[PDB]
Design a protein around this ligand. Structure first.
Ligand SMILES: O=c1nc[nH]c2c1ncn2CCCCCP(=O)(O)O
Ligand SMILES: O=c1nc[nH]c2c1ncn2CCCCCP(=O)(O)O
Lengths: 167, 167
């Protein structure tokens, strides 16, 4: 890539990782009686750049028999909620959402992140399902942006410093 | 997909159709000097369910050299509105004519599924991936009451589904 220094995770790697995550989600929600219309899996997509991760993870979940219902960031009480976030760094944004969604009394609530930065936590918070982990470097791609750009990049890559230093 | 009557368009057929559309869009926006950060193609996504179509189209556009900047629901920039379904064109005509009051450089429309027969006002999108007649379809972001967006193919919903779920 013209604007990067290292491809941390390609598109094929992320898809393979999400497939294994889907197999675990299909087993952890096996006896939840998940079925379309009646009782699907309410997916609460948080953050603007998560639509890439959501559209791919939701389709992979459907391949493993996990029906989904997508909401972007109510009819949350009593139903099973799964929060999707494109990246997890400080866990401040996600902890706020989980505490907000728990105000509606869901049957179960767990989190799944595509990119996890454990070395950026301002508060302790562990996500149930994690696609991939990334060190404390600024990355773009797969929905992750640098000022509303480089979201269409198919891979998670480290943004070259000359870009955001010049910008 | 034995909850449906037919599979109108597969995931591969749509992408291979979008490949040809992305080449078409790249040729039209060639003299616009599109580049990330400085001057990308502003993608206006509508109808909530278009997140599957938007996530695939911006990545396919990136392969053909078209940098994007997604917005979900801006002056002197190029606007390309994306909708998962174009039927009566009442939603798109309102969005388009509302965007033109902000004086964009050039606003066009790209729709994944288009019902050209079944429209309430004259409207012709600049880019259409596929046609669909008077039949209710789901999949690829198209829902029946917030469900069946995870279906990777545009399929016609079984009539008894909305006959059983309507009551
Ligand atoms: O590498 C990155 N690429 C895009 N955005 C990034 C990156 N690292 C941090 N962030 C911002 C995350 C936004 C909200 C999450 P949280 O920090 O609240 O957990
Ligand atoms: O086949 C369909 N599957 C899901 N939703 C559908 C379908 N046909 C029409 N619609 C509703 C479209 C909502 C708005 C469109 P418009 O206002 O631009 O005509």
């Amino acid at each position: 890539y013209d604007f990067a220094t290292s491809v941390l995770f390609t598109e094929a790697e992320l898809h393979t990782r999400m497939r294994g995550v889907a197999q675990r989600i299909a087993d952890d929600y096996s006896n939840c009686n998940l079925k379309p219309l009646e009782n699907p899996l309410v997916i609460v997509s948080v953050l603007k750049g998560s639509f890439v991760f959501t559209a791919d993870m939701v389709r992979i979940l459907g391949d493993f028999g996990v029906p989904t219902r997508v909401e972007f960031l109510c009819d949350i009480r009593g139903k099973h909620v799964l929060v999707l976030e494109d990246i997890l760094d400080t866990a401040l944004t996600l902890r706020e959402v989980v505490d907000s969604l728990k105000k509606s009394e869901p049957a179960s609530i767990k989190t799944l992140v595509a990119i996890d930065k454990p070395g950026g936590r301002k508060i302790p918070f562990t996500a149930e399902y994690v696609v991939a982990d990334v060190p404390n470097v600024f990355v773009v791609g797969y929905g992750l942006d640098y000022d509303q750009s480089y979201r269409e990049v198919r891979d998670v890559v480290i943004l070259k410093p000359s870009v955001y230093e010049t910008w």
